[PDB]
Amino acid sequence: PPHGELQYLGQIQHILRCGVRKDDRTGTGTLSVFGMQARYSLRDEFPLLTTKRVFWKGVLEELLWFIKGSTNAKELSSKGVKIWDANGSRDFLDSLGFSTREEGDLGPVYGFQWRHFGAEYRDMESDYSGQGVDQLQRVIDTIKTNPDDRRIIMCAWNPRDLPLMALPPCHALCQFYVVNSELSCQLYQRSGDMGLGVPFNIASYALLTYMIAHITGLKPGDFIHTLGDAHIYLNHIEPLKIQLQREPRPFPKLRILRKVEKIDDFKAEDFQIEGYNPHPTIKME
Amino acid sequence: PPHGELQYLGQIQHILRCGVRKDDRTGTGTLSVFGMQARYSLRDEFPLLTTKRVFWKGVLEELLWFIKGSTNAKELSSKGVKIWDANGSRDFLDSLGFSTREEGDLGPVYGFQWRHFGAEYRDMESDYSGQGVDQLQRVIDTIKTNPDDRRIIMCAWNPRDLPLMALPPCHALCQFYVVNSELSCQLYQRSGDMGLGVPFNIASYALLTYMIAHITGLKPGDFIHTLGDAHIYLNHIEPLKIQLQREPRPFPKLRILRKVEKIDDFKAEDFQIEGYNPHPTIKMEMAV
Ligand SMILES: O=c1ccn([C@H]2C[C@H](O)[C@@H](COP(=O)(O)O)O2)c(=O)[nH]1
Numbered sequence: 191p192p193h194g195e196l197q198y199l200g201q202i203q204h205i206l207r208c209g210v211r212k213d214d215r216t217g218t219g220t221l222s223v224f225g226m227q228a229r230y231s232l233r234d235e236f237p238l239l240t241t242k243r244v245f246w247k248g249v250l251e252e253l254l255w256f257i258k259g260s261t262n263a264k265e266l267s268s269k270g271v272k273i274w275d276a277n278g279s280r281d282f283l284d285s286l287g288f289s290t291r292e293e294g295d296l297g298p299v300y301g302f303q304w305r306h307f308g309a310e311y312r313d314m315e316s317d318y319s320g321q322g323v324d325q326l327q328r329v330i331d332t333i334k335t336n337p338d339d340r341r342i343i344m345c346a347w348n349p350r351d352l353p354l355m356a357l358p359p360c361h362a363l364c365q366f367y368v369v370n371s372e373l374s375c376q377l378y379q380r381s382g383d384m385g386l387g388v389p390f391n392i393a394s395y396a397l398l399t400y401m402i403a404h405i406t407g408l409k410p411g412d413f414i415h416t417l418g419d420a421h422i423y424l425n426h427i428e429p430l431k432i433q434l435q436r437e438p439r440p441f442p443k444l445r446i447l448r449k450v451e452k453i454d455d456f457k458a459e460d461f462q463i464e465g466y467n468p469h470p471t472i473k474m475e
Numbered sequence: 476p477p478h479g480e481l482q483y484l485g486q487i488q489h490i491l492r493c494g495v496r497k498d499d500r501t502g503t504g505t506l507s508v509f510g511m512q513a514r515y516s517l518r519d520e521f522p523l524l525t526t527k528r529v530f531w532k533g534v535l536e537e538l539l540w541f542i543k544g545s546t547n548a549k550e551l552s553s554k555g556v557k558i559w560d561a562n563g564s565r566d567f568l569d570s571l572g573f574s575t576r577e578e579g580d581l582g583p584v585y586g587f588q589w590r591h592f593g594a595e596y597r598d599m600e601s602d603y604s605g606q607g608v609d610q611l612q613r614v615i616d617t618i619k620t621n622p623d624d625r626r627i628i629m630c631a632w633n634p635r636d637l638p639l640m641a642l643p644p645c646h647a648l649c650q651f652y653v654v655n656s657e658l659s660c661q662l663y664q665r666s667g668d669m670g671l672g673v674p675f676n677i678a679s680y681a682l683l684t685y686m687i688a689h690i691t692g693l694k695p696g697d698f699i700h701t702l703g704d705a706h707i708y709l710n711h712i713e714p715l716k717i718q719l720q721r722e723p724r725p726f727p728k729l730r731i732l733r734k735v736e737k738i739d740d741f742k743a744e745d746f747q748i749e750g751y752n753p754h755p756t757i758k759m760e761m762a763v
Pocket residue numbers: 214215358360381382383384386387388391625626
């Protein structure tokens with residue numbers, strides 16, 4: 191009765207067996223399935239994949255960067271995490287018509303949507319204090335005062351702001367749920383590169399759930415990963431096949447090293463991944 | 476090939492067996508599971524549930540009402556479909572603090588969000604032409620010009636407008652997908668009353684997919700139903716146990732009776748459900 195990492199590997203196998211050939215904007219080509227769902231227990235385990243090493247430092251720094259409301263790729267890059275740098279480049283920005291935008295200015299992406307949904311975006315340096323909807327703090331407040339609420343949603347998909355963004359968000363929304371003192375999170379991810387993006391994305395939302403569980407005095411329950419276009423790039427098939435034959439090691443644990451009161455107060459040094467024993471990195475695309 | 480409706484019935488059985496007690500605002504109580512997903516083929520079949528009769532006229536008129544951009548419960552009620560009337564009443568509006576709102580004015584709900592996302596909501600009578608994002612038409616245009624696009628989303632969840640709405644939307648967003656000339660749709664439904672709401676909601680989004688497939692010259696593929704809080708109200712347990720004893724009948728077909736060019740041009744008489752053979756209606760009392 192597959193659990194943990196086997197859910198992810200079962201998804202890869204399903205796409206290899208049942209996915210259909212489908213081109214993408216890059217003309218690379220994929221095998222693709224529309225609509226998948228996996229459940230990862232968070233109960234005394236943290237779903238950082240072991241069949242290939244996941245970029246944990248990237249996961250953690252990106253999430254803290256989102257939490258601070260930043261839309262400046264330079265602020266993430268300064269932490270040694272370069273994953274958004276190409277989308278903030280001078281050439282890239284110009285290709286989108288944003289010639290007067292300063293380098294690094296991703297537009298109203300995750301950070302802005304999460305803390306200031308509906309505010310008027312100006313640039314990455316503007317003071318947005320008190321503007322728009324602080325969905326992250328509202329989620330936290332609702333969990334505290336009305337844990338049964340069926341509307342605990344944080345939504346990054348903002349149709350009005352899409353044309354200003356460097357890239358449209360893949361993580362369109364997430365929803366939280368509480369029962370029996372456990373906090374669960376479901377992510378709606380519209381588009382998933384199973385080889386390169388998805389392991390990172392699972393660890394991101396499991397981490398967010400651990401953070402909010404910590405702040406609200408609850409235990410982490412499940413992370414439910416829902417995909418729209420779940421795809422494997424054709425040039426990832428052979429590497430993933432090698433990966434698929436590797437035995438998972440038990441998932442590590444995540445420790446939070448002090449009592450933290452407010453979501454904005456977490457720092458990277460507050461977190462420790464314990465007993466992570468991955469098989470070596472597998473290079474993909 | 477098992478009947479598609481067995482997925483819905485398997486979800487009910489799972490919640491009865493493994494759902495946990497979870498209270499709601501009405502103090503009715505539910506059994507609840509978080510995170511479920513079912514896939515309903517749309518290929519030469521229409522998933523209108525047969526183990527109890529679904530209110531098809533409600534499904535179809537509500538959808539046409541969303542398409543027109545309406546936020547006026549009276550405009551749906553005039554078609555004989557009363558499902559939003561309690562939420563537009565003077566009493567319900569006043570309970571939310573909207574004492575100066577006109578009766579019927581649901582606020583910036585589905586219709587507004589789908590056709591005018593991001594516009595400033597005034598009232599249900601205002602002219603919003605050209606204001607906000609027409610997500611419904613943009614979805615149609617993208618399917619036509621770039622069917623591989625992985626961003627074909629229509630989103631009703633608008634955090635800025637939530638406090639103005641009569642009810643926050645259960646159907647937070649949907650996404651479309653095209654491959655092999657087939658159009659699929661996935662619904663993210665944050666909250667599902669499995670007894671009373673879900674059968675209706677499946678028919679709504681399958682109907683929307685048939686409509687857009689027709690407009691864009693594609694065949695309907697799959698409807699993927701994803702749930703957040705999937706729940707059975709405690710007072711629905713005994714009726715659902717009766718329902719669970721029924722064998723599904725083969726699903727009907729949906730016929731579209733003329734060639735329609737624009738989503739706004741569909742009329743109720745354009746649609747015919749063929750070979751629907753449900754078991755009788757099962758009464759389930761709505762929470763509050
Ligand atoms: O966090 C992320 C960001 C991007 N992608 C993937 C999916 C696609 O392969 C590509 C995004 O391209 P589009 O879906 O926007 O076309 O990157 C992910 O898996 N996770």
